[PDB]
């Protein structure tokens, strides 16, 4: 009979800290040994979110649609970086070169190519430590909501097409 | 008293495993029945990082304050990426825009406008897959620490203010 | 007996809703008392995937290693964004600034500075939110796959290197 109790007791504190473990609302109770489901909680693509009643679900969902404020809406292959402390966002983004960033499907990365003069000198940003690549040769992308930057020798702000616009006036 | 041998030592592996399942350093203790609670590391957006001991919690965490490496600082509305294969990053970002990406906060898209020449003929990058944006009507964004682009004609990098300063001066 | 059978009964209902709430195909086993390893899926950064035997082991490989579609490659310190609705991404990326964005791997903000003319006149984009930054003072990155950008009074968009070659020709 003690040994009955000492069981009983034992399942109870068992019960309790796997819910307690779970989280998500998830609870235990003693009259049936049912773990009630936890509901966690991610963020769809599209506004939305979603309820996962298991650890895994949640995973899944977390990769297949992302994080809240981290996004990508697709089904292709998964970005790849593989250049040092390199970033690569986006489907069949491919980030090999080092210290560089591929963002937007597709996007691909060459070595950055220092540029301090050109057939006029003295520019700013002349040695580069990699590049920031918004697409690749032949699915480029415009690239849009620029505030017009500083106009000066010192200058490593991109600059708009309002201001090559004004200069060519 | 068999039955109650089977029991006790079926209900430890019970415990032991899902200890094992939970991870994050849970033990299950025979004598109690509790199984300690996990610790598992999320990454704040400030360089510290909360230990959690659910699971509900840690994938909470995920979702408000982002993973290593990819954080918004933000309770804003989440991102939001309909577009075919775009991303939409940073609080309120819309990336509507097939093939395309908003990021940063309250960026939004616009269908790309192709351009070959203006009124200056011969430009690389004429066909756009899709737009690149840093923000919203009203509401750019300078973009900064941009390195000097070839300037040449086949050049598809992005060019800063030095080199626009040095071809007017 | 009865009280033998209503434990027998309910463990088996604790682990089979204990293997429901960890998905990944974890299974329970009332002949042993043993919960099968669930397999949860996370993406690494170089194109593979890899497999977990624990909740724990699947969130430290998200925040190691990345989500699908977001991978930095890197075991330097966490990207810190500090500024209000600010996005930081990258090893070392700091956003510090407002309504701003760091993204690659030492990224830093400071203040946008409004421009709206240079010695001409008449730039869009002369009111900035806050700044986008693709590196820091001497470690710029170079932005490439730069679609040609609209050359008008009202455009926004970036130029690229072919355009500051036309006008210059």
Known sequence: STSISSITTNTTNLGNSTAAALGGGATYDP????????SYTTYNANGTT???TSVGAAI?????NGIKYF????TDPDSVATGTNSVAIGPNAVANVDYSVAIGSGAT??????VASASFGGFAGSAPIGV???????????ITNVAAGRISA????????????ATNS
Chains 1, 2, 3 share one sequence.
């Open 154 to 165: 010192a200058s490593t702000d991109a600059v708009n097409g309002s201001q090559l616009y």
């Open 50 to 52: 979603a309820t996962n």
């Open 132 to 142: 920031f690549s918004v697409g690749a040769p032949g699915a480029e992308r415009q």
């Open 71 to 74: 996004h990508a809406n697709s």
């Open 109 to 114: 990365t060459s070595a950055a190519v220092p």
């Open 31 to 38: 009259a049936t040994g049912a773990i009630s489901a936890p």
């Open 60 to 64: 899944d969902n977390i990769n297949a």
